[PDB]
Amino acid sequence: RRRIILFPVPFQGHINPILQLANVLYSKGFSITIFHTNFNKPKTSNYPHFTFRFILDNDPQDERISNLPTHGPLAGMRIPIINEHGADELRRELELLMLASEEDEEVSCLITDALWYFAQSVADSLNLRRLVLMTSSLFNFHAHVSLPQFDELGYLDPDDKTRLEEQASGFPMLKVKDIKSAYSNWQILKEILGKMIKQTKASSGVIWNSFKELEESELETVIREIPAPSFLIPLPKHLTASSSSLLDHDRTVFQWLDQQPPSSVLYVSFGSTSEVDEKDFLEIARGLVDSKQSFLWVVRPGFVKGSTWVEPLPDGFLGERGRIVKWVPQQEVLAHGAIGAFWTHSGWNSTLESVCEGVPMIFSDFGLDQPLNARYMSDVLKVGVYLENGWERGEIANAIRRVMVDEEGEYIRQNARVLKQKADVSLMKGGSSYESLESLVSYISSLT
């Protein structure tokens, strides 16, 4: 009997992939222990089959995180804080857990978010193998390792170098526009992106939340840059991240979706972290109204700057085919037959979820890996359209309509339907994802 310890980054788009992986691994016969901060903790009563151990965040709270808040662009400062100061606590806790293990039981390995690059020299010190879980796409990692050339071509200078915004250099997928968006706040990113890449290269294995036919162009880079084995597993095809939600689900939404004709409803959701200037939020609203299609729109409270949920929204300005909710079980909704399209912020989990449900997309982005996910899905796969010039109602309403109603967008809908079938075929015996999971499980069993 073998135990796996998993250590997520405590944000929605990080615990979701990592707890899906833990359920999958638990299905292959492993014991699961999850290490978590108290901050942003999942409902552990939804995981009766997991052991939960809360660390680094506890109750005589250290002063670097003691006053750090819980909302907005800022709570993420715990990732650098914990990377630079958490090693000794992580080592005691791993030592305690190994010491407390029954002897018919062995810790096969540690799996952490790639962002926890500090975990690598901790696991080494304990002669424990660490595997990395990547929460964004092989394609964006190819951009990360391409960064030395980007900076030297003048691409990440947002001020002094502008206005050469089309086809980019050793990377014809993207426009220069997309590289500047991706790395806008530059040297916060490069230290973590540096140390993260350096220590996943040093890990014992990298698990990618993806499937081979989704990013086949990018495989050779990952094989050539990372000596550690790589495994491509599409987690949304295995299970939803539903029970690792950190907000309560509406689920009244399903009685209303049951009243829509098939493929007639646009799902709108801009992630778990994004915020928008009220001026922008009412232009998004009017684009939905001008589109003339039914929409179900998740507006997470705080989304709007600065209001507490939608107080700028008028009469029911929306309504008679529009609905606003605070939070849904997103993938379950994408799977309901009423949903014909998904307007996303191009977060990698949402994007993969929609790909795995066969829903074409409209792409907006808020930076980081998002504009490259958006360009990749919209121009290489061509499973949606990309609104790359900001918020304008007209251009919003034509994007929605072209994906959902226009004959001209039928190839985009067909692409989405086919991409899904490729994800399901990869899961069957002899498929790319199936063989990765079989390799990963046998690999983890040999580390023991």
Ligand SMILES: O=c1ccn([C@@H]2O[C@H](COP(=O)(O)OP(=O)(O)O[C@H]3OC[C@@H](O)[C@H](O)[C@H]3O)[C@@H](O)[C@H]2O)c(=O)[nH]1
């Ligand atoms: O209403 C909702 C909206 C969203 N969600 C879930 O929230 C998760 C959001 O993850 P996303 O990747 O879409 O995006 P987030 O912006 O929230 O954060 C993510 O950004 C991109 C990923 O690369 C990063 O790893 C993560 O930061 C999805 O798994 C989605 O299913 C819901 O369950 N309900």
